Structure formats: C-alpha cells, structure tokens
C-alpha cells in the first residue's frame, strides 16, 4: 500500500449522526471487562479502532479499587476494533500512562509514555516493533495527546509537552517517519499553554485544537506545516468557548491570539474544527463540571471573536449524565474527509461513591451531510446495582 495523504476536501457537515457505542460499564457488571480511561478512536484504511489506557485490571477485580490515579507502571494502551468492548482477549499494544496512535497507510505508530513523573520515557512503536525513544526534556510529567496523531506522506506528527506545558520551553511537535523521530519543532506563536491536542489532517498541514489548563477557557490552535516543520499557534476565536470550566454563554468572551483569562485554570480535552469561517465544536453542557455533552456550529466563530450566533445544536449526552474527554478523528470517504468525534463517559470515583473504581465507556458520532434527529446516549450503567 501507499502512505495516506488526506488530500481530499473536508466533507459538507450539517451535524453528526450516531456511529458507535461500547456499553463497557453495563457489560462490566456481568463479565470480565478492563478498567480504562482517556479513550480515543483512530482508523486504518478499512476499519476504526478504539484505544484506551488500561489500569492493568478488570473492573470486577480486587485491583480495580483506587483506579482514579492517572499514572502507574501497570497502565497499557489497549487496542480493539471499534465496538468490540475491552474484554480479556484485548491486546495491550505498549506500556503507557499517556499515549497517541495513528496509521500512516502502511502500519500503526503508537507513541507510548511511561516511567517516573520526574524522568518519563516515550517509546515510538511502529509496525509492532520499538523504533525510537526520547526522554522527558523538562523532567515534570512528559505527556501527549490522548488521541490520534496524524500522518501525511508517512510523516506522522505528535504534540508532546512537559513541565507546566508553557510555550516554546515545554511543548514540542515531533515529526516521525516509520517510528524514527526525524525532526522536532518547539511550539511557536501566541498559544501559551498547550495540552492534550485533538488533531486533524487539513492538507497540506495538520491542525490541532488543545487544552489550556492555566489561562484560557478558550482553546489553543496549532497549525503544523509537514513540509518545512514550521509551527504557528493562536486560540479558537468563538465567543462561545469550549473548555470546562468556563463562564456562562451570557458573560463569556474570547480572543483570537490570547487566552481569555475567564475561569482559565484547569480544563478538559476537547475539539473544534473550521468550516470556512464557521466552527464546529463540542463541549460539556455544564459550565463548571463534566456533565452532558453538546455540539454546535458557531456562525463566523472561527474568524470573529465576538460571535455567539450558534446553530445546529445537538445533545449527545443529556445535561444530567457524566461525560469526560472528547476528541476528533478523521475518516476518509469516497470523495471527502469526514470529521468524527468520541466522548469518554467517565463513571465511578471521585464523583460517584457507590463504587471503588473509576472507568469509562464511549459513544462515537460522525459528521453527516444528511439529516438527523435527537437523542441522548449516556453511559447507562446503574452503579446502585453493581454497588460495592
């Protein structure tokens, strides 16, 4: 096969139709399912795969207690075809408490991070073998996207960060060819803090929308040039901001270049993508905590920072039901590149005390040019019944 190039135009999008759901927590109450968090979806030429960071335990297990910690030596990247739940036959593709994966049109690249907080290692595993590695450069939790990397002509790109993720000091974009790290660019432009990027091919380049845990409730943008490794960055202009926490829509504001300084601290992994001057984006329906999930278009919301004219709203998860991380992934159609997204549906500790574990299920949606209706597709497990 040839390498992927994503050179088709982005599809027409009117909204998102339902595509997949794993039901992992409901199945966990009567079968051996893995504890996971920080899921994502990525596709090869033929199929989509679901990924997640396992906690090295099944849910109905003694080891599922205290699974709220994000970093332990036992976390591994699980990989399945999308919609096969994480049962005991699941492959652990690498040791990882942070990760990213993508298929270049010939083989899978996994970027797998593990080790001491002060001295972590990233392994670059390509076509099933370890090809390269890099050590923590700022010695304070090296970390990556928790979603798919993007490859154009076999050059895969991954955003990675260390320290408090400040700017050129801490965030680097690694350019990778068949698992070998061939180039490394410092972050450049006006994005101050950049974590957990959701990235998509935007031929000839890659575009990423990320998390700002310090200053923005607006989201950073990175444009990555694949041909000359140059980096540019800014923020999603939209006056309807997409992080959590954030201010109410009646009082929020945004800036194209700067963090908005409104509930700037903390965040959640999320996504947005341009549609000409409009932006499509998803966020938790609640402004302070990860409850519900909605997507909408903001008219001129990519270009105009005072715009709050939303249209084409969809509830994905009703405002009373838990959500979590969400991320984009791109799927090649016959004539255009479609944008799809997934939502992590986190259940258990800290917020729910019926259970000793923390785990997620997922729901997945794909962009459509057709029509679509309404629903709400939450996790749906009853923790009162599978109670400890």
């Amino acid at each position: 096969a040839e390498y992927r190039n994503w050179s088709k135009p982005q599809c027409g999008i009117t909204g998102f139709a339902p595509f997949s759901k794993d039901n992992s927590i409901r199945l966990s109450a009567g079968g051996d399912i893995w504890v996971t968090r920080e899921p994502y979806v990525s596709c090869d030429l033929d199929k989509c795969y679901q990924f997640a960071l396992g906690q090295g335990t099944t849910l109905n297990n003694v080891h599922s207690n205290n699974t709220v910690r994000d970093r332990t030596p036992y976390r591994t990247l699980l990989m399945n075809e999308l919609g096969v739940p994480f049962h005991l036959g699941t492959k652990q593709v690498c040791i990882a408490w942070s990760s990213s994966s993508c298929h270049d049109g010939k083989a899978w690249l996994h970027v797998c991070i593990t080790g001491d907080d002060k001295n972590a290692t990233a392994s670059f595993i390509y076509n099933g073998r370890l090809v390269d590695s890099v050590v923590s450069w700022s010695n304070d939790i090296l970390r990556t996207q928790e979603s798919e990397c993007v490859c154009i002509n076999g050059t895969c790109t991954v955003v990675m960060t260390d320290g408090n993720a400040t700017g050129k000091a801490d965030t680097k974009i690694l350019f990778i060819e068949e698992g070998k790290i061939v180039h490394t660019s410092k972050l450049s432009g006006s994005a101050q803090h950049v974590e957990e990027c959701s990235c998509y091919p935007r031929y000839p380049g890659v575009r990423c929308v990320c998390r700002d845990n310090w200053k923005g409730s607006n989201r950073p943008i990175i444009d990555i040039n694949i041909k000359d490794h140059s980096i540019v960055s800014s923020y999603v202009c939209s006056g309807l901001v997409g992080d959590t926490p954030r201010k109410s829509d009646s009082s929020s504001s945004s800036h194209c270049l700067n963090p908005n300084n409104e509930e700037g601290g903390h965040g959640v992994k999320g996504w947005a993508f341009d549609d000409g001057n409009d932006v499509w984006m998803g966020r938790t329906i609640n402004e302070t905590s990860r409850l519900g999930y909605e997507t909408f278009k903001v008219v001129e919301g990519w270009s105009n920072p005072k715009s709050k004219l939303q249209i084409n709203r969809q509830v994905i998860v009703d405002r009373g039901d838990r959500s979590g991380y969400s991320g984009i992934f791109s799927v090649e159609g016959k004539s255009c590149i479609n944008r799809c997204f997934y939502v992590e549906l986190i259940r258990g500790r800290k917020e729910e005390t019926e259970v000793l574990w923390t785990s997620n299920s997922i729901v997945v949606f794909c962009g459509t040019s057709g029509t679509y209706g309404t629903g709400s597709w939450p996790d749906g497990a009853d923790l009162n019944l599978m109670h400890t």
Partner: antibody, heavy 127, light 109 residues
C-alpha cells in the same frame, strides 16, 4: 509532625534569602512541603510546594522565576529561596505540610490544605 | 483565581456567647474548604477541612457547615482561647489555594 525553621533575616533590596525547614524524618514521602507567607497585617498567601515521591515543585503564578523550593530527604530539610527581593517581600514565611500527595495531570490536586506549620521565619527587606 | 471573602471583618462577642463567621467563594469550591485559627505571634492552626470535618485536637465547640459558594464556621461558646483571627481557604481542584483576608473575633469591651 514537627517543622523547625531558620531564625529571622534582614536583607538588602534586590538580593536573595534562603529560609530552611527541618521536618520529622520521612515527612517528604507523606506530605507536600509548602511555603506560605504573611505580610505583617495583610493576609496569607501560598507561594508553592514540593510534592512527595517525585519531588517536582509547583509555584503560584506571581513568584515564577523568583522562587525555588527544594528538599533534601537525607537531613529531611526543605529550603525556599526567594530572589530579586522587593521591599514588599517583607513578611513572615511559614513552611507547612499539605495533605495533597499526588498531582493527577487531568484532575489536579486533592486535599491541598495545611495540617502542620513551622514556627515562621520573619524576613525584612530594608536598606 | 477563586476569590475568598469573609464577613464581618471584625466580630465583637461576649465571652461564653456563640459566634458565626461567614466565608463566601467567588465560584463553587464544592466542600474543598478549610478554616484556620491564628492567635497573635503564632503560626496558623487548621480547625476544619472538607467544610465540616474537625481537625485533630479541635474541641467540639467548633463546627463548620456549607457547600458550593457559602460556608459558616460556628464557635458554640467563646472561651478566652477562641479570641483569634480566623481564615477560610479553598483547596478546590486547581491553584492558587487562596485564603480569605480573615475575620478577627474580639472581646466585647
């Protein structure tokens, strides 16, 4: 837990101070070691702290570039070094244990409150 | 940055009487809220954490209550020890771990 600090200081402006805090042995494996200051009638302010096991340090936005916090396990002594001392840095500096002992890169910090405190070191910044 | 604020700035009370100190947060801090007592010329002393859990050695006359944006510390009967400055502090999710500017509890003439 006992925390014992260095005696009082007077420093010229533009210089640096290095307050010390000696703990009960093994404190830096159980608690974050935190520095908090109090300008003499103004209010308490957190400066930063150093987290157990990994020993990574975290600083309040206004002190970044000006403060360093380090800890020697062997003497079980933590140090706070504050630099480019302005007259406004005249304060009592306390070390304290925070119950917080793990930073979740997604979910932040639990239990960052202060059960045990040092006796406080007065630092005066004057000509 | 969450702003803690306290009222009243000074609370004048008769010895043996009940006192209530109010602390209000500019955003929801769940129950991630602590109270400290500071006497003149001493380090602060933790009284309450989780908005309501009494810390070790703290006598039962201290009681904390509230959630979200509003909290109370109740001192059920002021003994001569209890005339001090009281600080609230949030510890909700993310720094800075801001303190209130403190309330003085003061003997009525």
């Amino acid at each position: 837990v006992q925390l014992v600090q260095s005696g009082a200081e007077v420093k010229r402006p533009g210089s640096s101070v290095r307050v010390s805090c000696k703990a009960s042995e093994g404190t830096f494996n159980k608690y974050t070691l935190t520095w908090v200051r109090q300008a003499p009638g103004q209010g308490l302010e957190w400066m930063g702290g150093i987290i157990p096991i990994s020993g990574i340090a975290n600083y309040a936005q206004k002190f970044q570039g000006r403060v360093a916090i380090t800890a020697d396990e062997s003497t079980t002594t933590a140090y706070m070094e504050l630099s480019s001392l302005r007259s406004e840095d005249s304060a009592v500096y306390y070390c304290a244990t925070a119950v917080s002992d793990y930073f979740n890169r997604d979910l932040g910090w639990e239990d960052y409150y202060f059960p045990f405190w040092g006796q406080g070191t007065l630092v005066t910044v004057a000509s | 940055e969450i702003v803690m604020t306290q009222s009243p700035a000074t609370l004048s009370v008769s010895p043996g009487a009940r006192a209530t100190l109010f602390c209000r947060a500019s955003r929801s801090v769940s129950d991630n809220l602590a109270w400290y007592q500071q006497k003149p010329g001493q380090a602060p002393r933790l009284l309450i954490f989780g908005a309501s859990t009494r810390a070790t050695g703290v006598p039962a006359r201290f009681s904390g209550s509230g959630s979200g944006t509003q909290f109370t510390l109740t001192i059920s009967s002021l003994q001569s020890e209890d005339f001090a400055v009281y600080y609230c502090q949030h510890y909700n999710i993310w720094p800075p771990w801001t303190f209130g500017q403190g309330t003085k509890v003061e003997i009525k003439r």
